[PDB]
């Protein structure tokens, strides 16, 4: 009932706040990408590995930009 949708608001509000801390810590992640990583994490993606894969592709992105 009301808690089915009240769940969607909590995860929205709470997605907003640790986005904000992501911005503070200067991670580079925008909202869109952040969410992707939340999903990946929740599926079982190891955070170390996931950061690491974010790092290296930023790297190639930057380098592939030339």
């Amino acid at each position: 009932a009301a808690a089915a949708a009240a769940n969607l608001n909590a995860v929205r509000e709470t997605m907003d706040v640790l986005l904000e801390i992501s911005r503070i810590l200067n991670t580079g992640l925008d909202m869109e990408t952040l969410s992707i990583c939340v999903r990946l994490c929740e599926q079982g993606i190891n955070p170390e590995a996931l950061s690491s894969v974010i790092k290296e592709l930023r790297k190639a992105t930057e380098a592939l930009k030339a």
Binding site: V17, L18, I36, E42, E48, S52, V53, I54, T61
Partner: protein, 94 residues
């Protein structure tokens, strides 16, 4: 329901894909190839960290934020719902 982690990686590559095409398409394929191979190498061979970061902004002079930040990591876990790992990642990408 939830997306195959294939398509998640696909979305993330596209999420930071830089700017039909050919060089754009061969790039995406290589973006995926850096993404997967990097996951694959790293996996073959908690809040402590995030408080130590808030300390450094304090020593960075950044008082205001170091205040805010520890408020947010206290306010996150003051809630009983689905994230040690995301922090772990965030603190990883600091």
């Amino acid at each position: 329901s939830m997306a195959s982690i294939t398509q998640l990686f696909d979305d993330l590559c596209e999420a930071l894909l830089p700017a039909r095409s050919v060089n754009r398409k061969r790039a995406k394929r290589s973006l995926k190839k850096v993404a997967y191979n990097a996951l694959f190498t790293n996996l073959f061979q908690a809040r402590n960290k995030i408080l130590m970061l808030s300390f450094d902004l304090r020593v960075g002079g950044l008082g205001p934020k170091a205040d805010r930040l520890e408020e947010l990591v206290e306010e996150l876990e003051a809630a009983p719902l689905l994230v040690g790992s995301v922090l772990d990642l965030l603190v990883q990408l600091a």
